[PDB]
Design a protein around this ligand. Structure first.
Ligand SMILES: Cc1cc2nc3c(=O)[nH]c(=O)nc-3n(C[C@H](O)[C@H](O)[C@H](O)COP(=O)(O)O)c2cc1C
Ligand code: SF4
Ligand code: FES
Ligand SMILES: [Cl-]
Lengths: 416, 155
């Protein structure tokens, strides 16, 4: 028995990452094995770790954690440095609108576990971690139970499948900070310290956990590894057809008729995600904006963009927060502002004060209590959160809000 | 201060779980809050010595992580998401209903110390907005009726 989980709707056109995760229940190792699970692990253990990195590199799999870094290339970087090496699965997923990772964790943990084992073997890591956010307690317990199932079947522990390879997966819990999703802050949290990002360079692939070469990969990125090895790198790049390979999970939320997680190829357009898959909008109202999590804002004139990592593509984590006619852009920008105010770790001054002033000035703007100075200050603050920032939060904390000021000036003008 | 056998055993399990003792801090602090309904300030010293860390290191951790509450004691923590999707889908309706049922606002604890409304950022269940947690349990808010029914499972 596990704690209560919300019944997140999940749908797929590819039947890969959501082959079992499309059903809202914990799939045991027996159900995973019945579907041909752990066959990729068996195949991978008969290959050299180098061959596996090459297949992952050749597959063209890119990180699913926002940054879109080629996974194969990242692994190649870590193996160029002596061991011991560490593999970390990033299950921190705390960006607003993002809920794609938990449905893999809670429904098909063995898909993730196998991916972790193959990836750890590929980089020579004998010690792996799953850093799961504290607000996913059920996911935590599900993963612990699934790790015990894997050991009992010989997929984890000592001399895995008679290959001689030893692996331990430790499940760590976060405790309420979005910043712990940032790969260096995550490592600090794992070392038992406050989730304060460290200045880069050094990079985790050379100096990570205990200053050792560490590979941090997102849950969804890891879930793609069993498919790459099972199908082969070739089959994997052919699925789309798009220049950005593999299945992709799209957490769709907001004023859509059917919010949920949609497994679609990245050639799918933003309009298709909303109208063809999510079932359009409530009352068939016009989509005014789409927030790519708390990162970007797309207007109704940008609906025909692809959901890939191309320069004109959707990008990010494929997070779709739909805003209709009835939704106030300033009120929305305030919720984004409030999110960065609450999540800045406070290490960098322009980020610490910038995120705070952006939210506080936006609240005054929204409440009709802002002076001409509060307006002029809001513009200044929004443009000056980035300076001296040592992590990605500071660089993007004003990005979405700047996009609304640029794409929806009529809406802001009402308040001015 | 003395930790009970039941909690000490669980704390020790966490400490021996990871390769290094200090890595178990968050899991130990989650377990302390689960037992007491808060992080008692007196419990920070025996925990510090259990991980082989300075007391100020542990204090810094409790203060940094949002889920750990060093001030208020509550048997059940109602974490109500105040982020964009839940706000757009009905955070204030859920907050109104909780106020009508419990007679408390966010950051307040019921006089009997049973429930505490905790405003939190995105719970990662945005398709099910408005979202709320009652300790480890997570639900979608539908109405005051549906809420009163859910909240009656907690005694
Ligand atoms: C503030 C911040 C929060 C982040 N949160 C997450 C997160 O919750 N999950 C995630 O996997 N990546 C997150 N990232 C990105 C990680 O730093 C990192 O790029 C990623 O885990 C690498 O895995 P990938 O190559 O598989 O995408 C975050 C980055 C920043 C700047
Ligand atoms: S940019 Fe912001 S979140 Fe990142 S380390 Fe600096 S203060 Fe912390
Ligand atoms: S916005 Fe509330 S659960 Fe994500
Ligand atoms: Cl389906």
């Amino acid at each position: 028995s596990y704690p209560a989980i919300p019944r997140i709707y999940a749908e797929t056109t590819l039947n890969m990452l959501l082959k079992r995760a499309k059903k809202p229940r914990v799939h045991s190792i027996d159900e995973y094995l019945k579907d041909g699970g752990y066959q990729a692990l068996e195949k991978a253990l008969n290959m050299s770790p180098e061959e596996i990195i090459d297949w992952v590199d050749k597959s063209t799999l890119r990180g699913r954690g926002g940054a879109g870094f080629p996974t194969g290339k990242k692994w190649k970087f870590a193996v160029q440095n002596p061991g011991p090496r560490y593999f970390i699965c990033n299950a921190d997923e705390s960006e607003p609108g993002t809920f794609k990772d938990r449905i893999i964790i809670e429904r098909d943990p063995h898909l993730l576990i196998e991916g972790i084992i193959i990836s750890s073997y590929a980089i020579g890591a004998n010690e792996a971690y799953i850093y799961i956010r504290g607000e996913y307690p059920a996911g935590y317990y599900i993963l612990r139970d699934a790790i015990e199932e894997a050991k009992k079947k010989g997929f984890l522990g000592k001399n895995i499948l008679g290959s001689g390879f030893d692996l331990e997966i430790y499940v760590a819990r976060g405790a309420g900070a979005y910043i712990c999703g940032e790969e260096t802050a995550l490592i600090e949290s794992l070392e038992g310290k406050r989730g304060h990002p460290r200045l880069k360079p050094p990079y985790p692939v050379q100096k990570g956990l205990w200053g050792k070469p560490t590979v941090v990969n997102n849950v969804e990125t890891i879930a793609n590894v069993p498919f790459i090895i099972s199908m082969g790198w070739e089959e994997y790049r052919y699925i789309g057809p798009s220049d950005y390979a593999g299945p992709k999970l799209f957490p769709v939320s907001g004023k859509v008729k059917k919010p949920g997680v949609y497994e679609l190829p990245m050639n799918t357009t933003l309009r298709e995600v909303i109208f063809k898959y999510a079932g359009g909008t409530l009352g068939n109202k016009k989509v005014k904006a789409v927030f790519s999590g708390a990162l970007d804002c797309f207007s109704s004139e940008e609906l025909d963009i692809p959901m890939d990592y191309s320069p004109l593509g959707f990008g990010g984590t494929g997070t779709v927060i739909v805003l209709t006619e009835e939704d106030d852009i300033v009120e929305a920008a305030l919720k984004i502002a409030e999110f960065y105010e609450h999540e800045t770790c406070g290490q960098c001054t322009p980020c610490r004060v910038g995120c705070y002033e952006q939210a506080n000035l936006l609240e005054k703007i929204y409440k009709g209590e802002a002076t001409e100075q509060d307006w002029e200050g809001f513009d200044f603050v929004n443009r000056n959160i980035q300076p001296t920032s040592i992590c990605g939060l500071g660089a993007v904390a004003g990005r979405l809000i700047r996009q609304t000021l640029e794409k929806f000036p009529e809406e802001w003008e009402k308040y001015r | 201060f003395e930790f009970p056998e039941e909690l000490k055993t669980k704390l020790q399990e966490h400490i021996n779980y990871f390769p290094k003792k200090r890595q178990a801090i968050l899991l130990c602090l989650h377990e302390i809050q689960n037992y007491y309904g808060y992080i008692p300030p007196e419990s920070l010293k025996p925990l510090a010595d259990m991980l082989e860390l300075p007391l100020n290191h542990v204090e810094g951790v409790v203060a940094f992580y949002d889920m750990f509450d060093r001030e208020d004691k509550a048997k059940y923590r109602i974490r109500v998401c105040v982020s964009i999707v839940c706000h757009l889908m009905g955070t204030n309706k859920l907050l109104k209903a909780l106020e009508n049922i419990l007679g408390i606002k966010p950051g307040e604890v019921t006089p009997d110390g049973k429930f505490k409304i905790v405003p939190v950022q995105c719970l990662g269940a945005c398709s099910e907005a408005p979202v709320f947690m009652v300790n480890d349990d997570e639900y979608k808010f539908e109405s005051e009726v549906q809420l009163n029914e859910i909240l009656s499972r907690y005694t």
